[PDB]
């Protein structure tokens, strides 16, 4: 169906201590496939999925040089931002970058992304038209002016509209088995008496891919937002994910409550009850 590729860069300055730490990971959908860490004993782009190991030595060597050059570029960016914000060179700062492409079922670019954060806040982002920028503050407007004067969005658009979509398609073809799969959750409802008047129902979803999922508790057909405890979707470590949703219910009314599970790998949304 629909798929995406994302690169996530993190650079953190270490003034007084020389060069910034630069770390890159790349994902297809919810599967990490490459990583780079400038602080490694011998920094290289490294495979993180089996379907990417097919790439020849030229793939790894050139991507490695690309990350090393990017780290030097991010060093200058970091220096610049410190000036824009007239921040002393004592503390450490974080530049994050996230870019990539979404493809629909036919293969066409659905959406391009290319955005940046500084110290954990939105800095500048390429607009959905891939021809303009949104700056977050007046410092980001400096960058915006430089980049619109230099037609920077055209270079980003070129990548997002060609190379990004093309390599994504190739990764999807090399890893069809793994990547095109939708693993449905394994589900059950557990029940724990709390007191003589209350009980916890917990609805579990285990072992699913991709990560996107909806878990809903309903009472007589009404969502229980205020009374539902949800955990963030979490990785199991074997390229699957887990989630649970819990509600506290009056003991003796557990049968009014149903857990609804929506996941791409399910034939149809599950409805689960607790069965004593």
């Amino acid at each position: 169906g629909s798929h995406s590729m994302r690169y996530f860069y993190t650079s953190v300055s270490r003034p007084g201590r020389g060069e910034p730490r630069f770390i890159s990971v790349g994902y297809v959908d919810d599967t990490q496939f490459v990583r780079f860490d400038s602080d490694a004993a011998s920094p290289r782009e490294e495979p993180r999925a089996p379907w990417i190991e097919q790439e020849g030595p030229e793939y790894w060597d050139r991507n490695t040089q690309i990350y090393k050059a990017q780290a030097q570029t991010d060093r200058e960016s970091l220096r610049n931002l410190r000036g824009y914000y007239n921040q002393s060179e004592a503390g450490s700062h974080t530049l994050q970058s996230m870019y990539g492409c979404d493809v629909g079922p036919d293969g066409r670019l659905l959406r391009g992304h290319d955005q940046y954060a500084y110290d954990g806040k939105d800095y500048i982002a390429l607009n959905e038209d891939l021809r303009s920028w949104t700056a977050a503050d007046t410092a980001a407007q400096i960058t915006q002016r430089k980049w619109e004067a230099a037609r920077e969005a055209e270079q980003r658009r070129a990548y997002l509209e060609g190379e990004c979509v093309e390599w994504l398609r190739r990764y999807l073809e090399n890893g069809k088995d793994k990547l095109e799969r939708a693993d449905p959750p394994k589900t059950h409802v557990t029940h724990h008496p709390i007191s003589d008047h209350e009980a916890t129902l917990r609805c579990w979803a285990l072992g699913f891919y991709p990560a996107e999922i909806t878990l809903t508790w309903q009472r007589d057909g009404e969502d229980q937002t205020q009374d539902t405890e949800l955990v963030e979707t979490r990785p199991a470590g074997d390229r699957t994910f887990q989630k649970w949703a819990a509600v506290v219910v009056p003991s003796g009314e557990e049968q009014r409550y149903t857990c609804h599970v929506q996941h791409e790998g399910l034939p149809k949304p599950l409805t689960l009850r607790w069965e004593p």
Partner: peptide
């Protein structure tokens, strides 16, 4: 595979 972005902030 990654983009080459020498543009500076």
């Amino acid at each position: 595979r990654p983009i080459i972005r020498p543009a500076t902030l």
